[PDB]
Design a protein around this ligand. Structure first.
Ligand code: NA
Length: 121
């Protein structure tokens, strides 16, 4: 149906916007602390601590399968990246501090992305 097609064109345009949002968010992580999943080989206890791991590569895989239906879903995953890190790592660490910075800087990007997703529909 043409209705189905038009919904698919909306999903695709959301996907394009979310890709640019994701690149912008990831530039706020020049150290690449959040680039890849935490390794269970190097933090073998990780999953006793953190129930839903997230990272930018996993977000990117989901994005390219057009797996985000809206901005809310994408933001939930970005938030898990931050929130996971701030629980596992202590306040005095380079990891926790990189999370705080990503959060603060990412908040600006997401503020306007929310207006672009509303605005362009
Ligand atoms: Na903690």
């Amino acid at each position: 149906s043409m209705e189905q097609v038009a919904m698919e064109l909306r999903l695709t345009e959301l996907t394009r916007l979310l890709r640019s949002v994701l690149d912008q968010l990831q530039d706020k992580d020049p150290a690449r602390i959040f680039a890849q999943p935490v390794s269970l080989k190097e933090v073998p206890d990780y999953l006793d601590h953190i129930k839903h791991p997230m990272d930018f590569a996993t977000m990117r895989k989901r994005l390219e399968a057009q797996g985000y239906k809206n901005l809310h879903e994408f933001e939930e995953d970005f938030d898990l990246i931050i929130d996971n890190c701030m629980k596992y790592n202590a306040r005095d660490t380079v990891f926790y501090r990189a999370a705080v910075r990503l959060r603060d800087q990412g908040g600006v990007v997401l503020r306007q992305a929310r207006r672009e997703v509303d605005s362009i529909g």
